Amino acid sequence: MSNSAIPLNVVAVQEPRLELNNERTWVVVKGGQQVTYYPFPSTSFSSNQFN
Amino acid sequence: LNLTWNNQQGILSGASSQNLYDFSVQNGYNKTWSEFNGVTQQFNGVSGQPT
C-alpha cells in the first residue's frame, strides 16, 4: 500500500458472498396509524375553471 | 349508513340495516322497528286486484 510515490492507507473489504460477521441489528419500521384517502369533489367547477 | 369520524373512515359500514335501529333505541328512539323500517304491505281480499 505504502509502495508508491506518496504512500496510501490500507483497508480490506470482504467479498459479497461472505462477511460472515458484522453487527446485524434488527430494525422495527414504524409510521403513524391511520392513513386514509379522501375524494374532494370540486366546488364551483365550470368550463374554464376548476376549484 | 357508513360514516367517517376524525380521520379514520368506514365506521359502521358492516352493520345491519336494522342494527342501526338497535344501538339507537339504546338512546330511547321510542318508535317500533316495523315503522322505522319502514314500509308496509296490505293484501286485499276480492278477485283479483293488486295489493
From Swiss-Prot, chain A:
It is found in: Virion. It comes from the Viruses. May self assemble to form an icosahedral capsid. Most abundant protein in the virion. It comes from Sputnik virophage. This is Putative capsid protein V20.
